[PDB]
Design an enzyme around this catalytic site. Structure first.
Site, PDB file in Angstrom:
ATOM      1  CG  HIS A 207      -2.266   0.645   0.895  1.00  0.00           C
ATOM      2  ND1 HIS A 207      -3.439  -0.060   0.917  1.00  0.00           N
ATOM      3  CD2 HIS A 207      -2.589   1.912   0.568  1.00  0.00           C
ATOM      4  CE1 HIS A 207      -4.434   0.746   0.616  1.00  0.00           C
ATOM      5  NE2 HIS A 207      -3.940   1.960   0.398  1.00  0.00           N
ATOM      6  NE  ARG A 208       6.005  -0.237   2.498  1.00  0.00           N
ATOM      7  CZ  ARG A 208       7.013  -0.952   2.963  1.00  0.00           C
ATOM      8  NH1 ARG A 208       7.811  -0.463   3.890  1.00  0.00           N
ATOM      9  NH2 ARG A 208       7.220  -2.170   2.501  1.00  0.00           N
TER      10      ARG A 208
END
Ligand SMILES: Cc1ncc(C[n+]2csc(CCOP(=O)(O)OP(=O)(O)O)c2C)c(N)n1
Lengths: 190, 204
Positions: free
Chosen positions: B114-115
């Site tokens: 998700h980064r």
């Protein structure tokens, strides 16, 4: 073409069936189906078209043949009678005033003159420039007088009349179209 | 999954490299190379290095879907579940299912970091996979590569048995093949079409 070959009997004539857009209808009786098929494919015009491979050109012919011949007007009817009168009048002149013309007679096939006229007139309405004709001996002088439009003086005066070529104009009775008409020279070799 | 000398199973991930330059025929060859060499113990150190994206198949055993773990170095892992009927239809007749028009399904998952990858991108990715597996152009490309002479089956909704009965339609198909079937027959020993000549219609 017999209903017995397709396992159908007299007892099915007034029963209703799905026909899939035949005669622009979804349902129809067998009596009505037989009437329409006989009117379209079994009277004075017989058609062969189902061997054609393109679907669009097969459908164009199908729709026109199943709609039928349009009812002609009184004026149209009298114009067909005047062409037949001219054709038969010329045959009588040839047989009586000259000899050894029995070989070249059109008697039996006088409907050729109104068929050729129909085609040339349709071409003039499409806007086209010329029609070129090639043919044998039978009916040649009749075509020179009634389709190309030569005067009688010109026809009746090296080689014979039955092999030389000619030119003329065709005006359109019920329109504003003109078209050139030419006849080609040829030998006796068919 | 390759068994060890002792007997205990141990999964390891091998890589098909430079996949963005391949057609289906090239892809199938590359795949079967890795599977072949694994079964006769001839994979090298270079075969296990440089993976960018991964594929797993829990559906083999019959699992419906999984939430798997993501190893360091990669951005996504894709999982393929079972290709059965749902459990609510597993005791129904073949006749009743055929009448209604009930198909089989496959469930596909995407697990992402998700980064660097946002949720909207992951959803768009799964929508493209769905479209491709039902698309005309996709199945045309595969058939071309494997030299299949017929047109592929197309995606459509079931139609109702109204108007012209379906039995009439099956009899019209038998007449079409008996009349016009020679137009698509394996008669030419070369893969040659004369460019000058016109091609006849064979939609029938
Ligand atoms: C090349 C050639 N072969 C043979 C002939 C001989 N010939 C002259 S008229 C004729 C009969 C033609 O009959 P058809 O074509 O049916 O027409 P019809 O004259 O009865 O209208 C034949 C064979 C010819 N003129 N030319």
């Amino acid at each position: 073409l017999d209903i017995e070959t397709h396992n159908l009997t007299i007892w099915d004539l007034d029963r209703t069936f799905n026909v899939g857009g035949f005669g622009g209808k979804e349902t129809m009786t067998l009596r009505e189906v037989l009437s329409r098929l006989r009117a379209a494919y079994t009277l004075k015009v017989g058609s062969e078209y189902t061997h054609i491979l393109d679907r669009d050109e097969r459908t164009w012919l199908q729709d026109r043949l199943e709609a039928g011949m349009p009812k002609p007007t009184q004026a149209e009817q009298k114009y067909i009678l005047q062409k037949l009168n001219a054709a038969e009048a010329f045959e009588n002149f040839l047989q009586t005033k000259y000899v050894g013309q029995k070989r070249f007679s059109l008697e039996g096939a006088e409907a050729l003159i109104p068929l050729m006229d129909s085609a040339i007139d349709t071409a003039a309405g499409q806007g086209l420039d010329e029609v070129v004709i090639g043919m044998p001996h039978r009916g040649r002088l009749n075509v020179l007088f009634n389709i190309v439009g030569k005067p009688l003086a010109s026809i009746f005066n090296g080689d014979v009349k039955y092999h030389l070529g000619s030119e003329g104009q065709h005006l359109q009775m019920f329109g504003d179209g003109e078209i050139k008409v030419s006849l080609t020279a040829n030998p006796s070799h068919l | 999954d390759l068994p060890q000398k002792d007997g205990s199973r141990a999964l390891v991930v091998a890589a098909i490299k430079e996949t963005e330059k391949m057609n289906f025929s090239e892809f199938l060859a590359a795949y079967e190379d890795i599977v072949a060499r694994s079964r006769k113990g001839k994979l090298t150190m270079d075969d296990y290095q440089g993976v960018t994206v991964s594929l797993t198949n829990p559906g083999g055993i019959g699992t419906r879907h999984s939430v798997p773990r993501l190893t360091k170095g990669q951005g996504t892992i894709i999982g393929v579940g079972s290709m059965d009927y749902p459990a609510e239809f597993q005791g129904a007749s073949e006749d009743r299912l055929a009448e209604l028009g009930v198909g089989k399904l496959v469930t596909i998952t995407s697990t992402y970091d998700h980064r660097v990858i946002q949720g909207a991108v992951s959803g768009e990715f799964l929508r493209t996979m769905s479209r491709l597996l039902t698309d005309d152009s996709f199945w045309d490309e595969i058939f071309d590569a494997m030299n299949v002479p017929y047109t592929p089956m197309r995606w459509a909704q079931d139609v109702p048995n109204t108007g012209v009965d379906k039995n009439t339609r099956v009899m019209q198909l038998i007449e079409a093949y008996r009349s016009r079937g020679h137009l698509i027959a394996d008669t030419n020993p070369l893969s040659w079409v004369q460019p000058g000549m016109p091609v006849p219609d064979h939609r029938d």
